[PDB]
Ligand binder design. Structure first.
Ligand SMILES: [Zn+2]
Ligand SMILES: [Zn+2]
Lengths: 157, 158
């Protein structure tokens, strides 16, 4: 079947499973992450690196930064499941909207390796920044999709 | 600068800038099988066109479209040089309701690579859109193959 983007959800809400590769709390976020999440050097982010699968096929690598203040608490156990359901059901976080950017590109050497493909084959680069309902950014995510396993859909109006 | 999909109009209305070169325009008394299926037709005439599209003299995509003649009423290759969707709303007064969009990433065929001035096998976006009138009548089946460098997308999600 097919991934739906319209959806500000987790992918979990489109079957899915995950290898968490990194989870950590960073005292000083990357400068890109400071910009994107309207942060400074001082306030903490969580970083999460996940390999996602759909029905046993590698779907993408996901690079996520979360604003600890807004999200309140994450750990790698909870990173094994749906972050979005944890956020709504446990943390009771009111997620409002999101900006999505994407383009097609060639894979890097290491990316082709992660996604068991060859250097330079196609991929989709997908960025998403999630906002709370009061406009505060809390999640900046970058995904590189496996070009044969990722199929997308959207309904317009 | 960035192409919005959200957003059920033509690309001329979507961004700009846009110009296009019409490569093929046929009126077909017998539409292909999947076009019958998809436009929910009899074996009903459709117009077929291939269009090579540019934003600012940069090649953006190749467009392969089928239109239901009965709903669209009339189309020729001149009208096809400009915004087909403005013609449809401004002239034909067609009420456009909604659309289904499908996309995936793939490699280019040699004939697509030539048209987009890239190499056989280099990446693209294959994008499909089916448009329906405001009464749920499907009237346009479109496949687009995007230039992977020149096309950069945006969704304002909620
Ligand atoms: Zn999730
Ligand atoms: Zn148009």
């Amino acid at each position: 079947n097919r991934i739906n983007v319209f959806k500000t959800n987790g992918f979990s809400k489109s079957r899915m499973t995950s290898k968490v590769l990194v989870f950590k709390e960073m005292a000083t976020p990357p400068k890109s992450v400071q910009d994107e999440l309207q942060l400074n050097a001082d306030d903490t982010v969580y970083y999460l690196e996940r390999l996602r699968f759909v029905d046993d096929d590698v779907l993408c690598i996901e690079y996520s930064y979360y604003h600890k203040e807004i999200v309140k608490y994450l750990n790698d156990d909870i990173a094994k499941g749906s972050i979005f359901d944890y956020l709504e059901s446990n943390m009771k976080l009111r997620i409002g909207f999101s900006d999505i950017f994407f383009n097609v590109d060639k894979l890097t050497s290491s990316e082709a390796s992660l996604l068991q493909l060859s250097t330079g084959e196609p991929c989709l680069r997908y960025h998403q920044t999630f906002y709370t309902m009061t406009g505060k950014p809390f999640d900046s995510s970058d995904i590189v999709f496996h070009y044969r396993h990722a199929q997308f859909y959207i309904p317009s109006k």
